[PDB]
Scaffold this active site. Structure first.
Site, PDB file in Angstrom:
ATOM      1  CE  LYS A 178       0.097   2.979  -6.053  1.00 33.02           C
ATOM      2  NZ  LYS A 178       0.941   3.142  -4.886  1.00 33.02           N
ATOM      3  CE  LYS A 226       4.260  -0.048   0.835  1.00 29.95           C
ATOM      4  NZ  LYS A 226       4.469  -1.394   1.286  1.00 29.95           N
ATOM      5  CE  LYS A 267       4.240  -3.625 -10.740  1.00 35.34           C
ATOM      6  NZ  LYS A 267       4.804  -3.030  -9.495  1.00 35.34           N
TER       7      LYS A 267
HETATM    8  N1  LIG Z   1      -2.031   5.938  -2.833  1.00 30.56           N
HETATM    9  C1  LIG Z   1      -2.753   4.901  -2.369  1.00 30.56           C
HETATM   10  N2  LIG Z   1      -4.040   5.061  -2.006  1.00 30.56           N
HETATM   11  C2  LIG Z   1      -4.781   4.044  -1.541  1.00 30.56           C
HETATM   12  N3  LIG Z   1      -4.297   2.798  -1.409  1.00 30.56           N
HETATM   13  C3  LIG Z   1      -3.018   2.502  -1.748  1.00 30.56           C
HETATM   14  C4  LIG Z   1      -2.148   3.561  -2.255  1.00 30.56           C
HETATM   15  N4  LIG Z   1      -0.946   3.007  -2.508  1.00 30.56           N
HETATM   16  C5  LIG Z   1      -1.029   1.693  -2.184  1.00 30.56           C
HETATM   17  N5  LIG Z   1      -2.263   1.409  -1.733  1.00 30.56           N
HETATM   18  C6  LIG Z   1      -2.724   0.089  -1.285  1.00 30.56           C
HETATM   19  O1  LIG Z   1      -1.906  -0.385  -0.212  1.00 30.56           O
HETATM   20  C7  LIG Z   1      -1.849  -1.813  -0.274  1.00 30.56           C
HETATM   21  C8  LIG Z   1      -0.400  -2.280  -0.232  1.00 30.56           C
HETATM   22  O2  LIG Z   1       0.249  -1.896  -1.442  1.00 30.56           O
HETATM   23  P1  LIG Z   1       1.852  -1.740  -1.492  1.00 30.56           P
HETATM   24  O3  LIG Z   1       2.399  -2.482  -0.299  1.00 30.56           O
HETATM   25  O4  LIG Z   1       2.312  -2.070  -2.896  1.00 30.56           O
HETATM   26  O5  LIG Z   1       2.110  -0.165  -1.250  1.00 30.56           O
HETATM   27  P2  LIG Z   1       2.733   0.868  -2.329  1.00 30.56           P
HETATM   28  O6  LIG Z   1       2.730   2.211  -1.628  1.00 30.56           O
HETATM   29  O7  LIG Z   1       2.078   0.766  -3.677  1.00 30.56           O
HETATM   30  O8  LIG Z   1       4.279   0.444  -2.442  1.00 30.56           O
HETATM   31  P3  LIG Z   1       5.059   0.277  -3.848  1.00 30.56           P
HETATM   32  O9  LIG Z   1       5.150   1.670  -4.416  1.00 30.56           O
HETATM   33  O10 LIG Z   1       6.380  -0.306  -3.402  1.00 30.56           O
HETATM   34  O11 LIG Z   1       4.217  -0.666  -4.689  1.00 30.56           O
HETATM   35  C9  LIG Z   1      -2.574  -2.206  -1.551  1.00 30.56           C
HETATM   36  O12 LIG Z   1      -3.915  -2.567  -1.210  1.00 30.56           O
HETATM   37  C10 LIG Z   1      -2.606  -0.950  -2.384  1.00 30.56           C
HETATM   38  O13 LIG Z   1      -3.705  -0.917  -3.299  1.00 30.56           O
HETATM   39  C1  LIG Z   2       4.087  -6.290  -6.021  1.00 28.46           C
HETATM   40  N1  LIG Z   2       2.990  -7.163  -5.479  1.00 28.46           N
HETATM   41  C2  LIG Z   2       1.780  -6.603  -4.992  1.00 28.46           C
HETATM   42  N2  LIG Z   2       1.449  -5.225  -4.951  1.00 28.46           N
HETATM   43  C3  LIG Z   2       0.196  -5.089  -4.410  1.00 28.46           C
HETATM   44  O1  LIG Z   2      -0.384  -4.033  -4.247  1.00 28.46           O
HETATM   45  C4  LIG Z   2      -0.288  -6.439  -4.043  1.00 28.46           C
HETATM   46  C5  LIG Z   2      -0.504  -6.586  -2.555  1.00 28.46           C
HETATM   47  C6  LIG Z   2       0.664  -6.241  -1.674  1.00 28.46           C
HETATM   48  C7  LIG Z   2      -1.070  -7.993  -2.343  1.00 28.46           C
HETATM   49  C8  LIG Z   2      -0.343  -9.201  -2.461  1.00 28.46           C
HETATM   50  N3  LIG Z   2      -1.204 -10.235  -2.197  1.00 28.46           N
HETATM   51  C9  LIG Z   2      -2.482  -9.743  -1.915  1.00 28.46           C
HETATM   52  C10 LIG Z   2      -3.721 -10.412  -1.574  1.00 28.46           C
HETATM   53  C11 LIG Z   2      -4.870  -9.655  -1.336  1.00 28.46           C
HETATM   54  C12 LIG Z   2      -4.822  -8.208  -1.418  1.00 28.46           C
HETATM   55  C13 LIG Z   2      -3.607  -7.560  -1.749  1.00 28.46           C
HETATM   56  C14 LIG Z   2      -2.429  -8.335  -1.995  1.00 28.46           C
HETATM   57  O2  LIG Z   2       0.700  -7.345  -4.465  1.00 28.46           O
HETATM   58 MN   LIG Z   3       2.214  -1.043  -4.807  1.00 31.92          MN
END
Ligand SMILES: Nc1ncnc2c1ncn2[C@@H]1O[C@H](COP(=O)(O)OP(=O)(O)OP(=O)(O)O)[C@@H](O)[C@H]1O
Ligand SMILES: CNC1=NC(=O)[C@H]([C@H](C)c2c[nH]c3ccccc23)O1
Ligand SMILES: [Mn+2]
Ligand SMILES: Nc1ncnc2c1ncn2[C@@H]1O[C@H](COP(=O)(O)OP(=O)(O)OP(=O)(O)O)[C@@H](O)[C@H]1O
Ligand SMILES: CNC1=NC(=O)[C@H]([C@H](C)c2c[nH]c3ccccc23)O1
Ligand SMILES: [Mn+2]
Ligand SMILES: [Mn+2]
Ligand SMILES: [Mn+2]
Lengths: 327, 327
Positions: free
Chosen positions: B193, B196, B117
């Site tokens: 990966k 979002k 990041k």
């Molecule tokens: N491409 C992916 N494949 C499998 N699991 C994922 C992937 N992206 C995120 N996750 C999982 O989804 C859960 C929620 O993560 P999060 O809400 O940060 O989603 P994100 O897509 O990474 O959004 P951002 O890009 O805003 O971080 C976490 O357990 C994370 O490891």
């Molecule tokens: C930016 N913060 C963050 N990104 C992630 O993937 C984790 C997630 C959303 C997370 C926050 N608290 C947790 C407790 C258990 C498993 C996942 C998370 O935190």
């Molecule tokens: Mn994430």
């Protein structure tokens, strides 16, 4: 409305710097402002490792000391920081608004050695943010501190302003209250401030020290090889610190104490100052000794204070959550 | 490895953004299943985590409601699991502070997410600490996450152990639960990966995407120009990701989907996977649309869940405070 907030770490015994830098202000302030909060900031304590039994006892001790100094729980809210959950909640929010280098470059961190920086906790790095939260949470206007915390006050101000820019005017931008004794020096190292954490017992004049102890510390105090007593902080750091202390505890001006000391050498003069300090402390020590014996009352005092603070804090935090978008 | 008596599942998802195939395959699908396999399961909409990136309050507000709809639609059942809002439970930040006092800056600085990041705030830097608190607060044993969080989970284990070493065994040392689809790849960059936060709408297969949109995304998916369909992650990253998705959505094995696809070109094959994804998402999408209609209900589900979590959390946090020396 106006509101005073200030904090002190429970760990170690309160000393002459704490007292002159801040606690004396606190006592005066309680009669000047309608709303006043004083916090024993146990959360800040753990930024450095603490033994739990020691910490628990320090909290009780600090409570006794503050009460003994004149903090009246009918006039102010004397509370325990850890008991109000809102502090950390707001701190988190605030931390999302602060860049890491801002913290890294604060003097209190920056001054450290590369090793010390590698060793210190993230809590230690981030305490100024928690400090900002402690203040902002109550919409405080006035904050008594020592000189070492001035830079942190600017951050607190910046945080208030930054939040306000985003969400609209919510937080008062707080102001510091400083005393002439904003930086009481160590007796053994006049380059340094006097600190609860100073491992050198001689350096630090504690509220609970015996008269014999205090005289001795002043006997051992570092000065210089000029006989005469003068006030010259750039030139004579130890002597000037001692003079300043004398003036503060007596209510006389620096100019007057210097006047009154003509014909007295530093060595003699230092013991005079010690006597003055002993007198100032003496009623406080008597009260502490009385208070230390009723643990229940001390616990009750904090509990009630904490309940009062919590009421105030909850309301503000709910407003904050709404602004942010949580609610 | 996990040999504590009371099992508990904890997982969190950020409200912000639109849930996508990677979230679903990586985590959410797991959650639904787990709620039947474990007696105690907690799922948190981690709004505190979202604000590590500045948010518009209206947007954040709406996001929380939308995430609640999405999860319910996916099959999270609030009488089987505790579905709650992180910010409503003050204890998380309380615990987080304590843990931050047990970790050093370099440990955080070296984490891949932070580095990624920031190539950045204190909140962003310290989210892993909050993550640990989120998990530990409930004495959770199992944590379903994607691959990107595995490094963070190693920190969570270290923090539990650190605390335990100091204060006695208090926290279970949790375990990650990982799926086959722990790293669903970006359709447009198979080395990355799916996220979002990915600006490229084509890379991301969203739960709310239309069938035409989904088909197009698969059609545009980056891959090699070898005609046959095979599984070879090292040599054929894009195709292999698509194969893996297909297998996950269908319930068939990778080896099986490859064999059935014998005689199929990659182009037709990708669209076949798209159809499979559309079918899987379709009932979920219909439910989301229905659920979005009743904001009061969504708010109430969280409120109830948050109250349940709060009671669990309060009890633990009080214990922690006693251990630390606050109480
Ligand atoms: N491409 C992916 N494949 C499998 N699991 C994922 C992937 N992206 C995120 N996750 C999982 O989804 C859960 C929620 O993560 P999060 O809400 O940060 O989603 P994100 O897509 O990474 O959004 P951002 O890009 O805003 O971080 C976490 O357990 C994370 O490891
Ligand atoms: C930016 N913060 C963050 N990104 C992630 O993937 C984790 C997630 C959303 C997370 C926050 N608290 C947790 C407790 C258990 C498993 C996942 C998370 O935190
Ligand atoms: Mn994430
Ligand atoms: N030597 C000093 N002179 C004036 N004020 C001081 C001095 N030392 C501390 N203070 C003030 O006392 C208040 C409480 O600070 P704190 O509890 O950290 O005390 P401390 O003596 O610095 O202890 P520690 O060494 O553990 O940090 C703060 O407002 C601080 O600025
Ligand atoms: C190590 N933490 C710390 N040192 C300080 O000097 C400050 C003090 C104790 C403090 C914490 N919160 C406050 C709010 C108002 C005024 C002072 C403080 O914090
Ligand atoms: Mn200090
Ligand atoms: Mn006198
Ligand atoms: Mn089918």
């Amino acid at each position: 409305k106006k509101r005073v907030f200030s904090g002190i770490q429970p760990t170690g015994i309160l000393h002459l710097g704490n007292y002159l830098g801040a606690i004396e202000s606190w006592v005066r302030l309680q009669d000047e402002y309608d709303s006043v909060l004083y916090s024993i900031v146990d959360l800040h304590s753990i930024t450095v490792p603490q033994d739990p039994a020691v910490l628990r006892q320090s909290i009780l001790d600090m409570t006794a000391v503050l009460l003994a100094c004149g903090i009246n729980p009918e006039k102010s809210i004397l509370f325990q920081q850890s008991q109000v959950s809102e502090h950390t909640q707001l701190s988190w929010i605030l931390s999302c608004m602060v860049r890491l280098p801002r913290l890294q470059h604060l003097h209190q961190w920056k001054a450290k050695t590369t090793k010390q920086k590698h060793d210190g906790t993230v809590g230690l790095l981030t305490y100024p943010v928690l400090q900002a939260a402690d203040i902002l949470l109550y919409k405080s206007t006035h904050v008594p501190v020592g000189e070492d915390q001035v830079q942190h006050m600017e951050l607190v101000q910046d945080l208030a302003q930054g939040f306000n820019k985003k969400y609209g005017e919510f937080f008062p931008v707080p102001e510091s209250i400083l005393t002439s004794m904003k930086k009481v020096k160590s007796l053994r190292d006049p380059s340094a401030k006097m600190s609860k954490s100073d491992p050198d017992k001689l350096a630090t004049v504690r509220i609970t020290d015996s008269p014999e102890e205090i005289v001795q510390k002043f006997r051992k105090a570092v000065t210089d090889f000029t006989s005469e007593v003068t006030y010259d902080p750039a030139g004579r750091a130890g002597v000037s610190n001692i003079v300043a202390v004398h003036a503060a505890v007596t209510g006389l001006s620096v100019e007057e104490v210097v006047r009154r000391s003509a014909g007295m050498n530093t060595a003699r003069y230092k013991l005079a100052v010690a006597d003055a300090v002993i007198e100032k402390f003496a009623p406080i020590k008597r009260e502490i000794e009385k208070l230390k014996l009723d643990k229940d009352h001390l616990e009750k005092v904090l509990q009630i204070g904490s309940a009062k603070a919590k009421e105030l804090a909850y309301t503000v935090c709910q407003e904050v959550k709404k602004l942010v978008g949580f609610l």
